[PDB]
Ligand binder design. Structure first.
Ligand SMILES: Cc1cc2nc3c(=O)[nH]c(=O)nc-3n(C[C@H](O)[C@H](O)[C@H](O)COP(=O)(O)OP(=O)(O)OC[C@H]3O[C@@H](n4cnc5c(N)ncnc54)[C@H](O)[C@@H]3O)c2cc1C
Ligand SMILES: Cc1cc2nc3c(=O)[nH]c(=O)nc-3n(C[C@H](O)[C@H](O)[C@H](O)COP(=O)(O)OP(=O)(O)OC[C@H]3O[C@@H](n4cnc5c(N)ncnc54)[C@H](O)[C@@H]3O)c2cc1C
Ligand SMILES: NCC(=O)N[C@@H]1[C@H](O)[C@@H](OC(N)=O)[C@@H](CO)O[C@H]1/N=C1\N[C@@H]2[C@H](O)CNC(=O)[C@H]2N1
Ligand SMILES: NCC(=O)N[C@@H]1[C@H](O)[C@@H](OC(N)=O)[C@@H](CO)O[C@H]1/N=C1\N[C@@H]2[C@H](O)CNC(=O)[C@H]2N1
Ligand SMILES: NCC(=O)N[C@@H]1[C@H](O)[C@@H](OC(N)=O)[C@@H](CO)O[C@H]1/N=C1\N[C@@H]2[C@H](O)CNC(=O)[C@H]2N1
Lengths: 469, 481
């Protein structure tokens, strides 16, 4: 077995294959640099209820994803125990918090933040999950600017965070302990694996978990595996002024174009703050000025003014694998022995133990986890929303980038922008395809891409229609 | 991974048959004894009731118009469902279908405020749906020989609205379940075991433990009491009470029976008169309805006399000298908020199919297909999402609507007897009933109002049972507000 990719997904499936099949040789590819790597840039939140949006829970496909995230949560305590068991005290703790506080402030669009807070509250009630709406004065540690302060707060019990760096170290250690072999090179081509040093590695099973590069690698063998783009994410490590940190995750609901504000606790007087999100049609390995300023401005005003005078340790950049139809690519292929584990966008890390168990069950002739069949990697592009829903959503999210800044402008201007944004986005959607509509996150990226890149997408969408219809 | 269906009524067996047929990979085990204690299904005629079940009150609420629509959808599944159940048997097992058509009769042995309004609502709902029917001369209704003072003056022929022999249906479902690889284990579930928010399986009343990744509760009136023992769920699954129903099998004086179902519209506290044809010189007559806070396995004298008096006067005087074969008693699962409990739970693998009151049997093919679709990652049937088993109590009617309804239905118990009393007395009772029912509704909860059928049961229950309901309603408010 060859696993292509050394993120959380690759290493998680690697650990589970090595542990449950001691007969077979499992080799895992990928370099220590982890170029464009989502996992090392992640806090990371074990996001289930925190990830709930009104928009997600209005589509069948969105309610399934949520259900899987709830299932994944139950696996984490034993998964961590089994990964820490292969190490010692000095390797550090994977878990950094047990609980999450969701904050509602007015530094955003009412159409996102008010709707999403209500949807989180609802989803917690439906699932009988332990939680309570608490007084904002009872949230520990936070010291917001009064004009940016929360007026409502939601304590979610058993929704926590891991140190993504200690998790990766623990996965590598646990992989080696179970007989896995780490070969620090990149796959160049799947033969039905040729590595970038010129060598060839034979195998009867290849699992592609190469993050945002996963589809580009399998497509060479193009219109049957949905494209994966780079959801470029910026986060930061900060040494706090006094070495303190909050006891819980602190977060807002998901915001304009799947951005969001959160602070994940870390050991040793550090905190993680994140995270920006921009779908890019080509990969990008560096934060923009705008991304850095926006992340820092939100954290200092909405969470703790003490972060203003705190020391910047590191600006982190990773690529969320962003699937063109908005849903993951998990499981089997029309090619025997070819598996794919990618397109997890915001929550691959959270779902990793469940997704790893699913793919291993499939590889052993099982059915794995029930709800994951819809997310077969070899599929027609899913249409989880009407064109109408997506056009309302993309205009709302565009307006939200203003309210999240937050801007100050004449009161006539937001009404002007609302009406003048509708036409151009409606025109783009109609021009792109008669059948497929890109989700909002990707549609804004396409709107502000070159004409050549738009035309290439029109060809792609047309070639996919001919293949499947 | 193993499926356990808890309950051997029409709902349990129907979902059992559909799981076994569409998932040949998995082992499906169905629990429940041949005694079918408190069983609604074996006490049912049963009518495939869609238009016959229409009341003015039902078609005035959003929730009521949805239920009606589902009943119309369920009707279309029955011909192929019967074909597929009879296919697993032979000639000598007998026919599931006993009639194709229903005649709705309007007589004056009831309240004008129910029977006149409900006859008009049935006529309207048939017209709206473009359903085949006609208002016919009463002299053209075959077989009936009513007492002239109890006779109908209007009659409504509904085409393709018929009846099944509930006993032959149950035998055919059991046979069809075994044919599709189901296993029947004739014991009762005592306890559902769950840990870390997932079903492990079922402890049975013989002491054994059966493991499963899917448990479907279709235990009729016992369904909520079984799931409520799990953490938090006591105030998250709406209570189901016993709609105790009395019916009878009669061997007719001459071996004859009507070619159609004969029925009135639904009457005081969802209590109705009907005759369902049977093979071999027998007829089914039903059916009484009384919500009881504890289960009851035996007919009262009052229920027996009322059922027999209505049938002999309003349908056929020949039934008076006809032989009583059997008095039947079953519990219609009566949900506290008046709507079914169908679908998924906060516990993974735990499904519920119950609280169907008067029409679970009719809706069984549709409800079975819905739950199987949900179990296979589908969305099932559109309108049934509203009836999720894990919910705040639904408030489908204002307190005002329910207080008018409970007084009207109370008065209807008089006109349906039918009573003979001084003409001042009904006006006195109308005015003196309003205060006590208004007082009870206000005392019970600031937010929830029990539907009329349940409110009258609460009115005439013990003070301890009323206080327990005040606590229940309060605990449900704290859980969901
Ligand atoms: C800013 C940010 C914040 C995040 N926050 C969260 C969070 O709060 N909660 C959460 O659950 N998740 C979070 N995530 C991660 C999210 O869940 C991702 O979906 C997940 O990390 C994807 O993991 P992966 O293994 O698929 O990809 P990656 O983590 O990108 O790993 C793929 C690896 O493959 C390597 N690779 C590329 N090409 C090749 C090749 N040819 N051969 C071999 N290896 C190759 C890459 O270098 C990389 O190391 C965050 C990500 C970002 C960027
Ligand atoms: C008098 C009367 C007339 C009716 N007429 C009609 C009609 O004309 N048309 C119509 O559509 N419907 C009719 N119904 C029935 C109505 O449709 C019901 O809603 C329906 O039968 C309910 O079916 P069920 O399978 O949920 O419950 P039931 O038929 O009550 O079956 C539940 C079964 O589960 C068993 N059980 C209980 N506890 C356990 C346990 N722990 N483990 C295992 N098994 C257990 C019970 O003994 C019972 O056999 C009538 C009912 C009655 C009482
Ligand atoms: N251009 C220099 C300047 O503005 N000096 C400030 C000045 O002395 C007062 O501020 C105003 N506005 O007069 C003062 C009130 O606290 O804070 C100062 N600013 C600081 N001091 C902090 C420490 O060196 C450590 N960490 C930081 O980030 C520094 N920022
Ligand atoms: N949260 C996502 C978001 O705001 N997306 C923007 C969105 O698509 C349009 O702007 C609004 N406000 O709607 C659009 C107009 O050019 O610019 C987007 N922003 C960008 N694109 C840049 C490139 O990826 C590289 N460098 C950056 O710093 C990125 N910033
Ligand atoms: N207590 C004796 C009695 O009253 N006998 C009746 C009596 O001879 C006449 O009626 C009056 N009122 O004199 C007579 C007119 O038909 O009916 C008699 N009753 C009957 N015969 C029926 C058959 O046995 C079958 N099933 C019944 O229900 C029986 N009822």
């Amino acid at each position: 077995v060859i696993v292509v990719g050394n993120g959380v997904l690759g290493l998680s499936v690697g650990v589970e294959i090595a542990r449950t099949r001691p007969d077979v040789r499992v080799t895992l590819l990928g370099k220590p640099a982890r170029q464009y790597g989502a996992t090392p840039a992640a806090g990371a939140m074990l996001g289930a209820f925190g990830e709930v949006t009104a928009h997600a829970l209005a589509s069948e496909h969105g309610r399934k994803k949520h259900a899987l995230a709830v299932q994944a949560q139950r696996l984490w305590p034993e998964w961590i125990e089994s990964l820490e068991a292969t190490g010692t005290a000095a390797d550090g703790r994977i878990k950094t918090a047990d609980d999450t506080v969701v904050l509602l402030n007015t530094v955003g669009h009412s159409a996102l933040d008010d709707a999403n807070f209500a949807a989180v509250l609802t989803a917690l009630k439906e699932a009988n999950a332990p939680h309570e709406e608490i007084a904002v004065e009872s949230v520990d540690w936070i010291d917001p600017d009064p004009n940016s302060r929360p007026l409502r707060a939601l304590h979610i019990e058993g929704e926590g965070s891991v140190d993504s760096g200690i998790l990766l170290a623990a996965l590598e250690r646990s992989f080696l302990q179970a007989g896995g072999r780490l070969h620090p090179v990149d796959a160049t081509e799947i033969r039905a694996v040729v590595t970038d040093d010129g060598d060839f590695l034979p195998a009867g099973h290849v699992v592609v978990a190469a993050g945002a590069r996963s589809q580009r690698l399998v497509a060479a063998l193009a219109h049957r595996i949905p494209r994966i783009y780079d959801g470029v994410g910026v986060s930061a490590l900060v040494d706090t002024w006094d070495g303190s940190g909050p006891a819980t995750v602190l977060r807002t609901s998901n915001r304009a174009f799947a951005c969001g504000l959160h602070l994940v606790p870390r050991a040793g007087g550090s905190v993680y703050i994140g995270a920006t999100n921009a779908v890019c049609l080509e990969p990008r390995g560096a934060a923009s000025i705008a991304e850095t300023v926006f992340l820092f401005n939100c954290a200092t005003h909405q969470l703790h003014r003490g972060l203003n005078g705190s020391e910047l340790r590191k600006v982190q950049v990773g690529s969320r694998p962003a699937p063109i139809d908005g849903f993951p690519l998990i499981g089997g292929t029309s090619v025997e022995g070819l598996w794919m584990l990618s397109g997890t966008y915001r929550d691959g890390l959270h779902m990793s133990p469940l997704l790893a168990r699913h793919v291993v069950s499939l590889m052993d002739g099982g059915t794995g986890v029930d709800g994951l069949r819809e997310f077969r990697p070899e599929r027609d592009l899913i249409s989880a929303w009407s064109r109408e829903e997506i056009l309302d959503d993309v205009v709302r999210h565009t307006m939200a980038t203003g309210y999240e800044f937050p801007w100050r402008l004449p009161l006539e201007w937001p009404h002007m922008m609302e009406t003048f944004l509708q036409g151009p986005f409606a025109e783009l959607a109609d021009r792109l395809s008669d059948t497929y509509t890109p989700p909002a996150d990707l549609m804004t990226a396409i709107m502000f891409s070159e004409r050549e890149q738009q035309d290439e997408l029109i060809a792609y969408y047309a070639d996919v229609h001919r293949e499947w219809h």
